[PDB]
Design a binder for this molecule. Sequence first.
Ligand SMILES: CCCCNS(=O)(=O)c1ccccc1
Ligand code: NA
Length: 116
Amino acid sequence: WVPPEVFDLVAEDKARCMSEHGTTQAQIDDVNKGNLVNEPSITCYMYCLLEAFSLVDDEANVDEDIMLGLLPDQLQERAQSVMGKCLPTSGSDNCNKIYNLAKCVQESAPDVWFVI
Ligand SMILES: CCCCNS(=O)(=O)c1ccccc1
Ligand code: NA
């Protein structure tokens, strides 16, 4: 559901976050197909990009209002619903907190969790 207008705003941060964490495009494709494992090269990439968009703080606490405001109008109720279930985040470190969030979301509402 991501508009075009994100992808070029995000390009620099996507490239940086991939480089920093060893992330491949194939891993991103895999998450978008609902396949995610607790591998830092992908979990830290998701934290990296959330942080770039100001959607998480230094301990992976989610700014739910900012997150909702980037979703299309017809995804927002369902997104707010799943986030009521899946927040607050918890885990061993920032990457594992986002792994746990992604898992919770994909199990409960699997149109919501898309990774650029
Ligand atoms: C709800 C999905 C969050 C994880 N994906 S994302 O960081 O690429 C992103 C995509 C679109 C809007 C905001 C963040
Ligand atoms: Na890894």
